[PDB]
Design a binder for this molecule. Structure first.
Ligand SMILES: CN1[C@H]2C[C@H]3CN(C=O)C[C@]31C(=O)c1c[nH]cc12
Length: 130
């Protein structure tokens, strides 16, 4: 229905606003663009599904996310990719791990405060009907 397409439009507006707020935070600069194959040729041999905040905006606009659950699986993949690629005790690996945890925790905190639970449940029931 037109009403269901208005529901998914409102979801995309909400997801673009949360993603912009994460992308401008200086802590999360390393997560804003794909890893350059030049500088890290090893990356795409270890990490089988790369993800970053520029790719997330492109996915919103391609209508890849019908629920906030869907979106949070890609925020969780940005964070788990950084934990698995940088697992060592040295300061450069500990710094990116602490940033990746802060990106995940910050996204979940904004959604807990600003997402209405009944809006999410509506998106889930339209998705399950298709
Ligand atoms: C997005 N979803 C739904 C449910 C809830 C369960 N989750 C599993 O990962 C995260 C979660 C969340 O934080 C919400 C805040 N309002 C609605 C929601």
């Amino acid at each position: 229905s037109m009403q269901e397409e208005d529901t998914f439009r409102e979801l995309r507006i909400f997801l673009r606003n949360v993603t912009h707020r994460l992308a401008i935070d200086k802590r999360f600069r390393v997560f804003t663009k794909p890893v350059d194959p030049d500088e890290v040729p090893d990356y795409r041999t270890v990490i089988k599904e790369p993800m970053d905040l520029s790719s997330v905006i492109s996915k919103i606009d391609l209508h890849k996310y019908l629920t906030v659950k869907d979106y949070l699986r890609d925020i969780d993949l940005i964070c788990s990719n950084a934990l698995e690629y940088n697992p060592d005790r040295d300061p450069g690996d500990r710094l990116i791990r602490h940033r990746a945890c802060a990106l995940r925790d910050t996204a979940y905190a904004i959604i807990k405060e600003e997402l209405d639970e009944d809006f999410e449940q509506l998106c889930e029931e339209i998705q399950e009907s298709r």
